[PDB]
Amino acid sequence: NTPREVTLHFLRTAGHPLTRWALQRQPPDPKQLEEEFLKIPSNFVSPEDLDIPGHASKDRYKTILPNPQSRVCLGRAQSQEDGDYINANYIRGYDGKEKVYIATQGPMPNTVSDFWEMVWQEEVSLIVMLTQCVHYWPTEEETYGPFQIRIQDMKECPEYTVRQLTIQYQEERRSVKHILFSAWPESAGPLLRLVAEVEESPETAAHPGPIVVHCSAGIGRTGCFIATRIGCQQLKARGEVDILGIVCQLRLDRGGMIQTAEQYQFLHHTLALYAGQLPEE
């Protein structure tokens, strides 16, 4: 069978379930975790696999491309702009539940309207931004294509900034919550606090929409955050986590999720911290 079907077979059958006790008390050593990560195929799509004319000006990186099986197709809200193309994929969440996250690259000045279009059509109530990219949100009030965004409220937390945005499209207004994480990491503390912030965030849309997560390329820091979230959900609900199975399921939705083995080993560390933080009850 073809190397492409070898890739698909590995990402569907590989799994290393770890009990809450094994993750905390006897975890795989870094050498084993590194070999395990290196076995996982990147699942990158080549420019030859996409037949979407005029997409290259929309991409930040020519090598990092959205998988066509699960990419986000834009609607027709924009007039001075044809094409349904955005560098973004739908990500399955806990138990392979459909469209729980959208992993996307950092918006370029020419893709800012495309980004706000996605937020509107997908009924997104929450955006998580991971950084240490152009500012696509206004300081007070800006118009981006057919969309008007206004800052309603802004609070400063020791680790992330929370903005309450209102997106306006003709007669319709929607509320979107925006969290900007600053420290991305040295420690996993701030990351679990970010996850708790996401967990405490109410749905503000008519129908539950996916959570937009981005960094710059939308695969590295984006991939860790989503894997942490699902991993926390596995530990809370089951008492075990299959980290290898999570990463593999991510690679199927978007190629290249989690770039480095350091990120893989930190992922084990974060979920180990979370396990100790669970109710006693």
Swiss-Prot record:
Expressed exclusively in thymus and spleen. GO terms for molecular function: non-membrane spanning protein tyrosine phosphatase activity; protein tyrosine phosphatase activity. The modification Phosphothreonine is found at residue 2. Substrate binds at residues 215-221, 259. The keyword Lyase does not apply. One of its GO terms (cellular component) is nucleoplasm. Inhibited in cells after FCER1A triggering. The keyword Zinc does not apply. Residues 33-274 form the Tyrosine-protein phosphatase domain. Changing residue 215 to S: Loss of catalytic activity. The modification Cysteine sulfenic acid (-SOH) is found at residue 215. It is an enzyme of class 3 (hydrolase). The active site is at residue 215. Keywords: Cytoplasm, Cytoskeleton, Hydrolase, Oxidation, Phosphoprotein, Protein phosphatase. GO terms for biological process: MAPK cascade; protein dephosphorylation; signal transduction. Its EC number is 3.1.3.48. Protein phosphatase that acts preferentially on tyrosine-phosphorylated MAPK1. Plays a role in the regulation of T and B-lymphocyte development and signal transduction. This is Tyrosine-protein phosphatase non-receptor type 7. The lineage of its organism: Eukaryota, Metazoa, Chordata, Craniata, Vertebrata. The chain holds residues 65 to 357 of 360 of the full protein.
